[PDB]
Structures are given as C-alpha cells and as structure tokens.
Enzyme design. Structure first.
Site, PDB file in Angstrom:
ATOM      1  N   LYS A  28       0.830  -1.187   0.000  1.00 50.53           N
ATOM      2  CA  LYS A  28       0.000   0.000   0.000  1.00 50.53           C
ATOM      3  C   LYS A  28       0.868   1.243   0.000  1.00 50.53           C
ATOM      4  CE  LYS A  28      -2.312   2.774   2.217  1.00 50.53           C
ATOM      5  NZ  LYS A  28      -2.050   4.237   1.971  1.00 50.53           N
ATOM      6  N   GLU A  80       8.733   1.581  11.834  1.00 49.94           N
ATOM      7  CA  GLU A  80       9.646   2.705  11.810  1.00 49.94           C
ATOM      8  C   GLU A  80       8.814   3.988  11.854  1.00 49.94           C
ATOM      9  OE1 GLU A  80      11.539   5.163   8.803  1.00 49.94           O
ATOM     10  OE2 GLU A  80      11.068   5.949  10.779  1.00 49.94           O
ATOM     11  N   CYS A  89      12.910  10.870   7.208  1.00 53.30           N
ATOM     12  CA  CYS A  89      12.736  10.208   8.509  1.00 53.30           C
ATOM     13  C   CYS A  89      13.850  10.546   9.511  1.00 53.30           C
ATOM     14  CB  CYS A  89      12.600   8.690   8.308  1.00 53.30           C
ATOM     15  SG  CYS A  89      10.962   8.252   7.657  1.00 53.30           S
ATOM     16  N   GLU A 124       8.146  16.899  15.558  1.00 53.75           N
ATOM     17  CA  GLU A 124       8.818  16.654  14.270  1.00 53.75           C
ATOM     18  C   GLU A 124       8.143  17.469  13.164  1.00 53.75           C
ATOM     19  OE1 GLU A 124       8.209  12.542  12.488  1.00 53.75           O
ATOM     20  OE2 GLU A 124      10.313  12.658  11.886  1.00 53.75           O
TER      21      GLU A 124
END
Ligand SMILES: NC(=O)C1=CN([C@@H]2O[C@H](COP(=O)(O)OP(=O)(O)OC[C@H]3O[C@@H](n4cnc5c(N)ncnc54)[C@H](OP(=O)(O)O)[C@@H]3O)[C@@H](O)[C@H]2O)C=CC1
Lengths: 498, 498, 498, 498
Positions: free
Chosen positions: B193, B269, B303, B400
């Site tokens: 996906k 993650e 990331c 973040e």
C-alpha cells in the site's frame, strides 16, 4: 532478616519468602493485602502471599529503572555480569532439592521430574546465558565510501532497558528462568509477574539473587493478578519490553497494551494444538513410549504437548492397546513420593476445565478408551485419558486441553499429504512431531509441518541452546538459544566519515 | 496490454500505469473508483489512479497467498529467486530516468537527487538483497544427548508467507524498495500500500516486475487509503506480517490491529526528533554543509532529518551566520531543472502544516532567523527556515516538522553530559549525530545517544548494508542490512533422535 | 600421591610437580633423565625436571588419542565439557597466589603482575572458552534442489582430534592457557610442550586438571627441548594440528614438518617489530605512560611490545625527557618484593642476546640515552633502555629485541603517509598503535597499519574475547576470541537427497 | 589485437588465446618458449601455448601487487567489486557454448556435461561470491573496560593481498572458478597456474575478464609447469597466500615451500579414497544409478569420486548385475557427440597409469568383472571398469585411481560399526556417501564417517553455497560457501581507549 514460611517436608526444612520483592527487599503489598496459595495434592492452603497493587508495580519499575540507569548492573563489564549469572546458577544448584520441593508443593510437579526439569533446566538456562554475556557481538559493515572521504560503519548491541516478564503456572521456575536468564544476560533489569496461583519458587528465586550478589533492583518479583499487575507492566511508560508466555487471548491483549502505551517490544509464546504423526514404519514400542510422553509429561501441563496424534491405519489398534497397557502401569500419587509417575493438576479451576473438556469429547462422539475423570482422592488429580475416533470437526480436535489427554485420529496407509493437511489445519503452530524409520518421509514431513519445532522420532526434547517459539497464532519470538537474546537487545548503527 | 497515462517530459516519454496491480495484471478498483494525484510543482492533476476497496484488498491477498502456496515462487531455488531479484534491479536500472522523473512529478523529488537516491538506492537495495537469497542460513546446535541415544538439532530459516507493506510518501519508491527487497529475498509474497498521495512509482515498479519475470501474485499493489486498505491488510487473517513506516500514532494503531486479528508479526519505523550535536572543535565549514544537509535534504521530508541542532556556545553565532549565507544560495524551483536544489513539499496539506508549525515557533518565542513562509510561486514550495534561541520546553523542540526547518539551541562550552541529557529527553530514538574532531568525545557521545543510528562527522549516510530502525517510540525492527531479513523469516527448530 | 618439590617462599608453601604428565599421572622420563630449571633472580637451580624423550612423546600422543577416541572426553555433552573447563578455571583461581609465585620463581614475572596477568588472564581464558562449548554451531544451507527430489545441506563443526601445543617462555602459564582453553573447548585432546626453560607452571596446571576432574589423557605435558619433543609432535602421524607461538625461524621449520609428515593443520604466532606512532596532538603524559607500558611491560618479554616508536618531531625531545624521568623511577629487584616494578629477564641466554642487541645498536650509530646493560647484581637483570636517533636501515629498527628497549625515531610534523610507510616497511605484522586525539587521523592510520592488532590511545590492552594473531611473517591464525576456535575445529558438510 | 588460435568446431568458430596473460595483456613467454596442448579425443596437437618462465612469474606477481596496492581494484567499494564479478559471470554465460567446446577439446569433457557443470557451475560460482563482497562483516566485541576509561574493540576483515592459485587438469575452468571467485570476492589479486596439460579455458577466461572490465593485473594466468611456475609462486616473497588442489605429494611440497619462503597462508585440497556405503535397505535401482555416477562421472576424473563401494552382502550380487547391465549401455566416444556418456581420459600419461592400476588390481587378486584397458580407438579412451572381491589390504583399496574404475567390497549384513571402521581406515578424508532408507543408519553413519563431505542417498551433489574440503591427508581449508572466504581474508583487531 527475611520473613519466611517454614515447613518441614521431604526431609528438609523449607524456608519460603512470601512477600513482594522490590529493590532488593521483601516488602508487604500496599495495605498489607494478601491471598492464599493452594497445594494441589490435598487442596490445602500453603500460606498467604503479598498481593501486589498498582503502586507496587510502580515501585518495582522505578527500582528496575534506577538499577539499570544508575546502579552497578549498568556499569560492570559484560564478563562480570556473566560471572554473577553463573554464581546465581550455582546458588540455585546448591538449593535444588529445596526449589524442587517448593515446586512439588506449589505446582504439583513430581519431585524427581522437578529436579531434572523444573529446576535442573533452570540451572542450565542461567549457566547457558551467563556464557553469552561477553560473546554478544555487533558487526563492522563494508558500506559504500563517500569518496574522496572514508566511512566506517559498525553496529553495537545494547540492552533494551527495563523489561516486564509475565509467565504462566505450568513450569513456574523454568518459564521464569528461560526469559529472565536471556533478559539479564543482555544487560537489562526486570519486573517479573509469576502466575498468581504459583508464586513460591519465584519468591525463593528472588532470595537466591541476594545470595548470588545480583545488585538491588535488577530483579523484582510481584505475585498478583495479570489484570492488575500484568496490565500495569504492559502500560508502564518506563517499561520497554514485555516477554509473555500464556494464552492466545491474553497475548493479544498484552500486544494491544504494548501498542497503545509506548510501542514497547513484545514477544509472545501462546500455546498450541501440536500434531504428532506416527507412521506404520516406526519403532512401535518406542512410538508408544514417546507418544505417551508427548501427551502425559508434566501431567499434560506442557506448552508443546502433542494435542493430536495421527496414527497410520494399519498400526492404530496395536498402538492404542499398547498405550492402554502402559497407562495402567502409571502410578498416580503425591508428587513428593519417589514412586509417583503422575502428580496432581496445577489448580482446581484447571481440573474443572479438564473434566468439562472430556464430557464435551464424549458428547460430540469421540470414543473414550480410558480416563476422562478426576481421580477419587484428595487434591486435584486427573486420570490419564485416551480418546480415539477423533474427527477433524470435533472440538477436542481443535482446542488445547493442557491436560493428560491423548486425542487420536487415524489416517489411511500411504496418505502423507492428506495427513499433513489435517495436521496443519490449525491457527496454532507451536510444535509437532513425526515418528518413522523412513528418512525420506521424516525429512519431507518436517519441511511441510507448519510449526516452530518439529521432533523427529522423539518428543519433549527441548534444550537451552535450541530456540523455542511458535508460528501463526502461537505467537513470535524465541526463548532459549542465541535467538532469544535478540528479543532483549537493540542494535545501534554508528557511521563515521573521516 | 496495459493502459498507460502517457506524458512527454524531461526528454523522455513517461508511460505510467494507473490501475491496481493484482495477480500480475492491472485492474480497475471495485466500481471503478478513482482519485486524483497531484503534482506539487504546480498543483495540477497528474492523472486518475484506481482507489482500492476492501474487496480489492481481499483479491490482492488471495493472489499473494496463492503465489506463495502453489505458484513457482514457492518452488524455485533460493539462488533462482535471487536471479529474478537481480534481474528486477537491472530492469529498474534500464528505466532509471523514467522512474526518477515519475518521482519528481509525483513527490516533488529533485530529479538529480531522485536519480541518485530515490531510484539509485532502490536499485542497490534489490541487488543487495538478491545476493542474500542463497546466503540465508540456519544452524546446527550442540544439544545435550539423550544417552544411550543421539540427538541432532538444526534450525531452518523459512519465509513467513503473505506480507503487507504500508509506506509513507516522502520516498515513495525507496521506502517500497527497502521493505519489498528484503521481503521477497526471504521468499515471501507481498501486498503493498503506497501512500495515497504518491502511488505512481509503485505502479510503474509493478510493471517492471512483469518485465523481470517475477511470477504473478508475488507483488500486488493497492493505491488507496490507509484507513481502508491499510486497515484491512492489518486485519486480514491470511496476512502474517506487516512492515510499516509512518507516524507513531498510526504505528500504534497498526500494532493494535495486528494483535487483535491473528498476532501477525509487525515492524515499525515511526520517525523521530533527532538531535545533532556540534562541538566547537569540529571543522566548521564542513559542519555547516553537513548540518544543512541534515535538515534540508529532500526538502526536510526525511525520517532521519536532524530535528534539533545543539551548537556549542563559542561557535553558535558564526555557525548561524554561515548557515544563513548558504541558505541564500539555494535554488528553489522545478525539481526537473538541473540547477534546482530545493524542490516543492510533497503535497498541500503538508505545506499548510509547516506554515502552522513555524507560526507556533514564532508565537512561543523562538527567533526566526530566515524563512518561515510559503515561497510565492505556484505549487507547494516552502522556504528553508532557521530558528535560533530554541528552549527545551518549546513545541518546536519536541515536535517533528518533516520540513526544511533548522531548529537551533546553544549549550555551554565544556558541557557534554548536560547536552546529552537534553538531546536524549525525547520519547523518540531514530537518528542522531555528533560533529567533533575529538576521538574521545565522538566515541563517548555515540555511546550515550539513545538512537538507532548515530552519525559521526557526517549525516544522512545510509547504506543498503547498514541496518536502520528506531528505539523507544520510533518503533522496532530494521530495514536494510542482514538484520532486515529477520523480520521476514521464521525459525523452525528440528530435533532428531537416532 | 604426587612427588613435589616443596618450597617455603612468599608466605606460602609451594608444592611443585616436576615430572612428565602423561595419561593423568606424573611419571619420570625414559631413563629417568632430568634437567635443571633456573631461578633468574639469582641464577640458582630451582629443581630438577623430567626431560621428555621420543618414547615419552609417543606415549603422550597415545594417551591423548585414546582419551579422544575412547575416553569420556569424546562422549560427554559439549555443555558438560564446558562445565569441566569452568571448574578448571575455578581451581586455578583457588591456587592463584601459588601459581603467581611459581611464575615469579620460574620466569622472573613480578608477582603483582603475575597475579593480574599471567594467572588472572589465564583464569579468564578458561572461563571464556568454557562458555563457547555449547555455542559452537554449524549451518543449514539453501542449496539448489535436484528437482523433482529435494535436498538438505548442513554443516557439522567437529573436533580435529589430537593437537600438539608448542609454547615460548615469556608468559608460560598464559600462553599455555590461551591455546589449551580453545583447543579443549572445541573437544580436542592435547600434548603440550612448554618452553624448556619454564616448565613449572605448566606442571602445576597439570595437577590442577586432576583436581578439576578433567578425564585422564586429555591434557598431557612434556617438559623438554623443541628440537626433540617439539619436533616429534610436529612429525607424529596421529597428531592432526599444531598450535605454535615462538620465533619466525622455528615457526617455518614447524610448518615444514607439518607438511612433510601428514599435512597437519598449523597456526603460527611468530612475534614482530610493532610500530607505535605518537602524534603531537595526543595527551602527552598519557603517551608517556602508555608508551612506557608498550615497551617495558613484563620486562619487554611481550609478543606485542612496541618495537619502534615514531614520535612527531615537535614533541619528540619533550617525550624523551619525560620517558627518562619515568624510567629513573623504576624499581629493579626481586619479583616477589611488592615495590619491584622491573624484574629480571627470563633466562641467561636471553640476557646475553639483549646485551649484544644494544652493542649492535650503539655500533650502527643510534644514540643510547640510558641502559643497554646487565644490572650489576646476581641473576639476569637488564637495565631499562632508551635509544633515539634510530634510522630505518638500522638492525635495531628491523629486528625484535623481546627486551626492555625503547627504540625511538622522529617523523616530520604533518607527515602521515610517510610515517605509515616506514611503520609498514617490515616483514612482520603482529601489533601496532597510534596515539592522537584526532578522530580522522586515528581511523585512517588504523586502516593503513599492516598489523593484526591496532591499539588506539592505549597499548597492551588484550582481552580474552578479542582475537590476537599476526599478518605476513608474524604468522596466521588467532588465539583468543571466537576466531581461535576455528583453528581447532573441522567442518563436515552433510548433503541429503530425499 | 589479441592473437587467437582459430578453429571451426561444434558449429562455432573458437577464438582461443594461447599466450601468457600478465597485467591485462596476452604476451609471449621469455624467449618465446612454447609447448603443445593435446586433444585427448584423437591425440592431435590443438596448438602451441606459451611456456611461462621464472621471469614471467615475477612479472605476473608484480602486476598483481601493483593492481592490489595502487590500482582501482583496491579502491572501489566492496559492492562495486561485487558488480564486476557479477558482470564477469554474465560474460562467461554469454560465452558458455564456446567455453564448453574448448573444455571438450582440451580436457575431453563431454560437451553436454561441460555446459552444465564445467561451465554452468563456474558461472554459478562467480555469481554466488559476487553476492558476498558487501556482506563480508567483522565484529564489535564486549571486552572488559579499563575503568574509569572506556574501550571499544572491533574487527575488520581485510584482503590478504597477492594470491597464487595452482590447479589440476580434471575440471580446468571449474577448479579455476571455485578458487578465483572467492579470492577476488575477498578483494585480492591473483596469479593462476593452470595444469600444464589443460591451459586453454583458463586463457579464454582471462580474455573474458577484459570484456568484463576487471582492472588490469587483477587476474594473471601463466600456463607452464608446476615445478617451475608453481614453485616460483610458492617461493615468491610478495605472494601472501597459495590455494592448491592436486595430489597429496605436491601439496606437501607446496606447503613446505610456503613455510620456507615467507610463511604465506596455504589451503590444500588433496584428493581422496572416498567410501560409499550401500545398505540392503536402500532403493536399489537408485543406488545403482548414483553408484555409477559416484565412479564414472567426468570419466572418473573427479576428486570426490567414490574410490571404494561397500555393498551389503545380501544385495551385492544383484547390485553388480545391475551395474554391468548399466555399464554395457554406456556410449563411449567423441565428447561432441550428443549421445556420448563416456569421453576420453584427460591425457596420455593418465591413461597409462589407469592401465597399470588395473593390471595391479588383477595381479593382487581382485576380480575384474569388466573393462580394465584402453578402448581400442584413436585418443585416450579407457574402458569403464568394475572390480569385485576387493579386500582392505589391496593396493586398489588404498590408492586413488582418478579413473572410471568401480572398486567393490562386501560387508556383512547387520554390521554397521565394522563397515565404518573399514571406510575410515584411510589417511584420506575428502568425501563419502551412504545409501539407506533408514534414518537412524543414515544419521549415525554420517556422524561417524571421517570425511569433509558426506552424501546421503545421493552422490556428486556439490553446490557453490556448500563448503568443500578434506580432512586428514586430503588437506584443509574450504572451497565454496561462506567458509571459502576465510582462506582469502585476514582479521584485524582494533582496540580504542577513550
Ligand atoms: O508520514 P505520514 O504519511 O504522515 O505518516 P502516516 O502514519 O499518516 O501514514 C503512513 C502510511 O500509513 C497508512 N495508514 C494510515 N492509517 C492507517 C491505518 N488505520 N491502518 C493501516 N495503514 C494506515 C497511510 O495511508 P494514507 O496514504 O491513506 O495516509 C500511509 O500509507
């Protein structure tokens, strides 16, 4: 000075702590709450044990966190951590008769078996993992170089930190040991929750950590309920890893709780419905001996017990008669008596489940060949049971008994793939076995079985060096072997440019 | 015969499939539903892409299950699996310009960066893991022997089965490749996906699996929403593992969904708030270059981007002065132009979030040194931004951004433990970095940083051989390196007695 | 009972076996031949020791071979082999003061050092390798399948059989332990040839194997000459592996003898001429301390001793000045006195070599700053020696002294590759070191040094977990670490078709 | 342009280099010395080939040293080294019909077999080891800490440098490939000495390294005599490792020469006298098929060939009947005829040895069932031979024929340990096999066989992933598998204090 419950039994004077073990101290629970622990040989109360409360879980986690972050355990060499764990194994070995007796009283473990397995294997476990401490190694990795500069990449294996261990009641000391030994060998500190019904070897183990010189706060033990203590461990923001053995449904709920708090790591061993396939070309007398062991070992209270036996049509009848002959020879009795083969079930609620299990098996149409009932005597004894004519749709073909119940189905002569299909038609995948003298069959069948362990011409042959864990709904992650360490370690990648 | 969206751009002809990929064929979603994919350079619609429905998810999983259980992928040698994966990497390389151009259009990736990283690292990933296929090995283990008999114990590494992979939008092809290469190298089949806002390289990759001869059903791709397609993958009884990269909040929900269905394995993650500590004894010019890369690489949609810089007090002003000088030199514009070094943010909602993020920073008292606003041109361009005077309690010190926002705090000269404590004061633990010429400080700081990756005198230096994953609430499990294979493998223990 | 030489010394009563140890008993050599072992503190005879003959070697090998093929050692679990080696380490620990005293008497080892290193590291070595026994594992390998059949391939790690261990005199017990621990942990049996001049700790070790319960014939010890005993071991048709530490010229002859007899396996640790590079940007006082250690540790009788120091020109004169100050503070005396920090050289012929070495150093033009001579006192003491102005063409720049002789060269400021080139211009490659606070220099220099071990900002930091062995003419194969086990194992590949 | 010998054959025009290959160029030997290579199918001269002299070896070693120390090969990423080796395998595949025709011509390899094995496995070998380059990893090790300071210890895997490879004539390209692929994957450069009688595929291979872009001097090939070229390689001061396959006596001499020069590393594969044990409970028709392969594969010129078949008494006579029936069906002839089963022996001197071997077997009392002499026809064909009534003391029971000679002994029914004893009574230890349907016999027999490889229910099943090497006087070290890499790597330990 530690408070004990003293009891003279089995030609020993047992000295049993009964309080919570937190930060190197035995202490009462909040508001001095307690509960009774029950002896399955006669239904008697052994003693009262502290009943850990939420504030006690928090004190234990705080002590584990302090011991990890500021205490000696986090500062000593990996080699010295190993020395402490080897000394702990030596202390356990010096107390092995006492520990095996406590296990016979608390869990109904036959004493001679408890020396060899419940206790003997726990000692092997600590000694095995003690030798891992200074042999846990990362890597140096040949990465692409940011020319005209250079790069070095290494990995560091590091402890995860504070761990919670939640265990079941079938092998109280041994299950504790499997997880705890690996967890401590990796440099972690721990809060252990023994099953409420079997806290005593865990509390005696706790006193042994003091004799071994394990720093205060490294091991913390909290007798009490899963729905209170276990739940708070899985929700705690300072706990980084849960190790769990128990039922699929509780395992689900624990993983959920790890998720919704702080995505703590989890490993799960969730029991099973393990098939054993017995071909006509096996050694029949050995197959009877091992086939019976696969079911009756530790009164069936065995995560890897064969939950179905498929027996080839042409030997099925001879196999069943030989099993009945051997079942008649089994001595049921007090676990402390040296001639006892078959001790009591662990606790009363479990015995009741087993009676109900066998009623349902008769109800749905399987043939009861022997057993099926509580033995007429005090305590919680259950008769070794054999069902035949079991069909794949039956409840007893699908559900795990966790008791001494041999559930036998036939398969047609020569029907290898058909029987595998039936053996694999479960959402579990913990263990499995195959008996056959034919190498081609043995190898093909072990490839095709959908289980974390395949025994070939043996059963119940676990070893501290051989990883044990399930597939599918039996969970994931390993206890025992080098593989177990990975559950308790994290990998840090360090990349330099120069 | 595949339907394409054809587009002449960047000196080539793009031929973009836009349908679901199931069982080796491109097919419309149920009821032929579609949605629009948007080009972040001008806000225009690129094309309509099929919008997968629950029944499409079930179709994809059933194709993957059948490919695994009965198709050629489950029968071929590990070495031959490796050859197909190496041929896939070669086909990707033959189409590297086309893939990099799709990525520039769909995600705003600067074309020259996309060729090297988005696409080039994906080709490396497949070649790396292709080499692993016939080098994945189990063990033979020296267990205690049941004398007078003998025992042999081995482990087999086996595929887990059907996997679900759910990825974010920041590196569409590269995130897909990291996970898919390891997944397939282990012998699994997969349903992927892609993030809804970036499906186009995934569907072109799918066409390339046909050119490489990957058997039908092995790779299945479902553009669509996580709340619908992702959810159903995590709930599916036939899926055995989920690999996920994304937000902490969605990761929690996926792990929860894995628990409540069939205790499917999961790796996570989950991003972070990665600190970069710059000491006064570093090479300052190089610290500016690498410090800017640590923030601005791939328009901060990264990331492992450094989410806080701690700069030693004695160089803080000169560091900030030099950063501002270099930011002024950055060329913002169309990702396909060779002079561009800062492309647009990936989609409009994310651009809004960054504007809001910087508003909050100014509000709470952080000094805006430059940037802070959308760039006044078409599409979703955001200014490279520098905040100074950031204090630990500030929202921009904890949250973040996932955008090109350099967030600077000072620390006193000679502090090491004080800045480490501030750097580790986060529930995240993905990456981190330290710039210093001092060996002792470099080693000490990397030891003490609580992050899955520590860069020393560099930043953003990932490599297909070097494992990558987070600690704490950044998740668990590795992508890249040998360690990534372990997420995609199960261990079967086989014990013989003879 | 065993015959001992009894000696009251160091507040202990020493009980020293003095005979051959064969098949679990102390026995006289053929013809009751003996030789004298000499105390290097005063040159006196400690005692007479059996002098092994060819017939004695043949008996030792026969005992080792029987013990391997038919004895208990070859039948017990790896885990139980491990327990016996742990028990051995514990017995050595119980005798550590006595062992350290024997080593002081026999080898001139300073007692406080012997306790910590000669003996303390021997104890660690046996405990480390005891942990390896049940963790030595082979593989299962994903080979191509002979369709329509299937294949399984595994490897088994097996012992090699009877090994001969030939060791030097510098660390008699420690060198014995390094090799013997790894050899035994791998399941082999052994014949050990201690250096003729230092037999006594080996013979006491032999007695300790009896106390630990090591089966008879597993460990056999033959004091005697290499040209007789060593040579026969290397020639013997039933010995399958030689582990050797000593000089390059004897190593070559051993390897030749292994070749010409039965292609026995061989590993060789052959000493070296190890460079230490000291940059101007190091911690200078630390460089003096570590630099002193690199040369003068164990009276320079140290395989890894720095045989050349290259000191950067801007700190050279200050380095030398500070070294001379420290050298003057060294207390030369009886190794049993607690204030002693420099003991006597091992034996007389070696003292003679050191005197000639320094004569040649002066002859060829190096400047003797201090020492160079036998200390005026009984025994075989040598004065701590410093040479400067050493040029690359000089004998003392090329040849290993194995004595307390610091050999100093300058290199120009800012040179790195030029000094590396001089450091690598040797046929040896055992160890090396670099002192610098610069991370980039330390990493680059360690990459470029052509040596089996590189120390960075330390020296003499060996560890039982860290492999030790040379490159080029320093030999091949490792002692210590997991890598050492490989010298003592063979790999069998088993391939099934089914 | 390269000079070629051109030959229209097998529907191809072969272009065969015939000169030395040094520093990426084909060059004449010193004085333009040459020798004839002989076609074993008809005894004709194929062409003249350069005959390397001592000065040519020194040039090849100088080219290899420079390529390693200063050329591109020592500078590229491990991953890029892997890409070049993959590309070389692809170039070999593109030329596979040509290489297999050259092998038919030069070695008498049957074309259909040469395609699948001589050439097909060589291609697999390069592709396998190409995948290892970026997966060769060192360690980080948890050593004791020199408190209050810290320590980091890591290991680095590094190439050894210039290697010499000396190979035999039975599988000219395949033996070259085995060793060369692992050597180059580890980052070394190499000088290869093919058997003097079979240089042509090696020289063609050399040309293929040019087409693959292998940097000049990485690979050097010197046809010529062992006693001159091979000797100089093993004596050369700049060669650091020899990999050798051939006879035990040459291997001893090579190992001696490595010793006396510079202690270069050595691995040795020295052939065998491999036993195949065939029990009465095997699948008999398959035992005959595999038993025949075990002997007659590649006209017996096969280092793992079964040199003795032990057949259980009750099936012996039927086994031999079936064998003679199968042998009579074997088509002997030109290796290019597509129905040839049995090609000619490699060269004339070997054929003459085979004739003398069989005369000796008859003379000493073995029963010659069929064959035993040179087929009457041009070339060097030897009749496929069967001996029965072979006894343990016989020459043909001890000595390796390396020819198509089945050497059969009975063993008594129900004996297992006794046949093992006879199978193990050799100083060789290369390979072995056991045919039996009984899992318990298979496992026990494989455990007890003293051989580097055990085949169970198959024979000649080698695989590039499965390590291959001998025990005892069959030598040491592995070709193939991960284990092969260790012969070609060295380990550097790096220890920091900070
Ligand atoms: O980075 P950012 O993209 O912000 O991180 P997110 O966590 O928001 O998204 C990462 C990926 O997870 C998917 N996802 C969202 N919700 C679920 C869920 N309920 N179950 C499974 N998958 C889900 C997303 O789908 P989507 O593309 O719909 O956002 C996206 O592909």
């Amino acid at each position: 000075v530690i408070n004990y419950v003293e009891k003279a039994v089995n030609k020993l004077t047992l000295q049993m702590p009964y309080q919570l073990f937190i930060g190197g101290e035995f202490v009462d629970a909040e508001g001095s709450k307690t509960y009774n622990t029950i002896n399955p040989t006669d239904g008697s109360v052994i003693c009262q044990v502290s009943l850990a409360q939420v504030s006690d879980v928090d004190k234990a986690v705080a002590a584990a966190k302090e011991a990890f972050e500021n205490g000696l355990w986090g500062k000593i060499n990996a080699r010295d951590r190993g020395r402490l764990l080897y000394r702990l194994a030596d202390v356990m070995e010096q107390h092995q008769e006492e520990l095996a007796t406590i296990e016979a009283l608390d869990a109904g473990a036959v004493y001679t078996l408890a020396l060899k397995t419940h206790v003997g294997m726990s000692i092997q476990t600590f000694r095995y993992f003690a030798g891992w401490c200074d042999k846990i190694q990362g890597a140096t990795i040949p990465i692409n170089q940011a020319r005209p500069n250079r790069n070095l990449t290494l990995t560091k294996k590091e402890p995860v930190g504070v761990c919670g261990i939640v265990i079941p009641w079938n092998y109280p000391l041994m299950m504790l040991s499997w997880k705890t030994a690996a967890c401590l060998a990796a440099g972690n500190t721990v809060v252990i929750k023994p099953a409420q019904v079997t806290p005593l070897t865990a509390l005696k183990f706790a006193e042994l950590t003091l004799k071994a010189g394990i720093p205060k706060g490294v091991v913390n033990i909290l007798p009490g309920s899963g729905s209170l203590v276990g739940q708070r461990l899985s929700d705690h923001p300072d706990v980084r890893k849960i190790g769990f053995t128990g039922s699929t449904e509780v395992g689900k709920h624990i993983m959920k709780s790890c998720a919704l708090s702080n995505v703590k790591k989890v490993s799960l061993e969730l029991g099973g419905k393990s098939p054993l396939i017995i071909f006509a070309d096996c050694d029949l007398n050995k197959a009877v001996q091992m086939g019976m062991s696969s079911v009756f070992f530790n009164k069936g209270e065995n995560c890897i017990a064969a939950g179905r036996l498929f027996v080839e049509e042409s030997i099925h009848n001879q196999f069943v008669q030989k099993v009945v002959e051997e079942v008649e020879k089994m001595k049921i009795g007090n676990p402390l008596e040296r001639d006892t083969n078959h001790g009591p079930q662990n606790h009363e609620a479990h015995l009741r489940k087993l009676v109900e299990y066998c009623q349902r098996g008769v109800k749905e149409g399987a043939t009861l060949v022997c057993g099926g009932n509580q033995v007429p005597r005090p305590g919680f004894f259950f008769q070794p049971t054999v069902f035949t004519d079991v069909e794949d749709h039956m409840y007893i073909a699908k559900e795990e008994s966790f008791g001494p119940i041999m559930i036998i189905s036939r398969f047609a002569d020569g029907d290898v793939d058909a029987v595998l299909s039936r053996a694999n038609a479960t959402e579990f995948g913990l263990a499995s076995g195959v008996f056959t003298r034919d190498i081609n069959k043995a190898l093909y069948v072990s490839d095709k079985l959908q289980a974390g362990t395949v025994f070939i011409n043996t059963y119940n042959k676990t070893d501290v060096a051989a990883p044990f864990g399930g597939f599918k709904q039996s969970g994931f992650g390993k206890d025992l072997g080098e593989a177990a360490l990975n559950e308790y370690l994290r990998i840090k990648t360090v990349t330099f440019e120069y």
